[PDB]
Ligand binder design. Structure first.
Ligand code: PQE
Ligand code: PQE
Ligand code: PA6
Ligand code: PA6
Ligand code: PA6
Length: 192
């Protein structure tokens, strides 16, 4: 429930769950066809496709791990920097990671993991820099960041997409957070 967590975080998590459930009682076929990244010159105009691929999941663990991490850290971002910030990081990470994954492997990918890494990347450098607005992950979510770089370079799991989405995701988050950290400092310069 909310009563505390972010509205955007909640909406995105619940949408993923609803679309997955739908995948299970009829057919992922319709959903996969409408939601996949453009794989056709005629689909270039179907603009939702640049983002929608993130709402489809391929297994129970796939969606379980993605939503857990997104709910926790996407929530931190929302509660700390605002709902607009989270929505934006989502739209942009979704579009950029899909763009990158598509170039290296084609339009056959689904899931929120590219957004998760952008989110983890954002929180990571923000925490590292203006260290305050956060008080450490937990001790495990900090580790599963070093031993997770092998989760795509030398496959220990496999987030049905590829590491191109994960790496470009982290990069989007790291760059965005560095910029925000900077813009923050720049304006505080003239405050007591
Ligand atoms: C201790 C630290 C605390 C951190 C905890 C934070 C908790 C935050 C809550 C986040 C909410 C998570 O929501 C994700 C739930 O997603 C619902 C979708 O379905 C969930 C399924 O649950 C797991 C099922 O696993 C089944 C494994 C068997 C098959 C493996 O995958 C193949 C799936 O095939 C389909 C079978 O029906
Ligand atoms: C035999 C073994 C087989 C070989 C297997 C090899 C395994 C390696 C596979 C890994 C794939 C590598 O792919 C890496 C791709 O990454 C390339 C990076 O390019 C993508 C990154 O794109 C970044 C684009 O620009 C960043 C966007 C950030 C924008 C931030 O917004 C500005 C903020 O403005 C302020 C608003 O508040
Ligand atoms: C956010 C871009 C993806 C929109 C879309 O076409 O897919 C989701 C739709 C409905 O979701 P909306 O978020 O568009 O209402 O399918 C589920 O019923
Ligand atoms: C960054 C998200 C949207 C960018 C885009 O228009 O994608 C076009 C790419 C290729 O674009 P070029 O820049 O290589 O022409 O192909 C998509 O199917
Ligand atoms: C990292 C600071 C310099 C990079 C840059 O030229 O950024 C231009 C704008 C943002 O400028 P800032 O003033 O916020 O750095 O967009 C970046 O992607």
């Amino acid at each position: 429930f909310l009563a505390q967590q972010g509205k955007i975080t909640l909406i995105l998590t619940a949408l993923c769950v609803l679309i997955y459930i739908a995948q299970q009682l009829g057919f992922e076929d319709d959903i996969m066809y409408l939601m996949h990244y453009p794989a056709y010159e005629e689909q270039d105009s179907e603009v939702w496709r640049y983002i929608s691929h993130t709402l489809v999941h391929l297994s129970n663990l796939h969606i379980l791990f993605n939503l857990s991490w997104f709910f926790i850290f996407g929530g931190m971002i929302e509660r700390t920097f605002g709902s607009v910030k989270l929505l934006m990081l989502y739209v942009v990470a979704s579009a950029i990671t899909g763009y990158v994954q598509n170039y290296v492997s084609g339009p056959a990918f689904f899931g929120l993991s590219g957004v998760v890494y952008a989110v983890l990347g954002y929180v990571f450098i923000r925490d590292k820099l203006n260290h305050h607005l956060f008080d450490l992950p937990e001790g495990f979510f900090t580790m599963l960041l070093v031993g997770i770089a092998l989760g795509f370079i030398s496959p220990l799991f496999g987030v049905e997409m590829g590491n191109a989405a994960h790496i470009s995701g982290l990069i989007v988050g790291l760059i965005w957070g560095f910029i925000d950290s900077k813009l923050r400092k720049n304006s505080l310069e003239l405050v007591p």
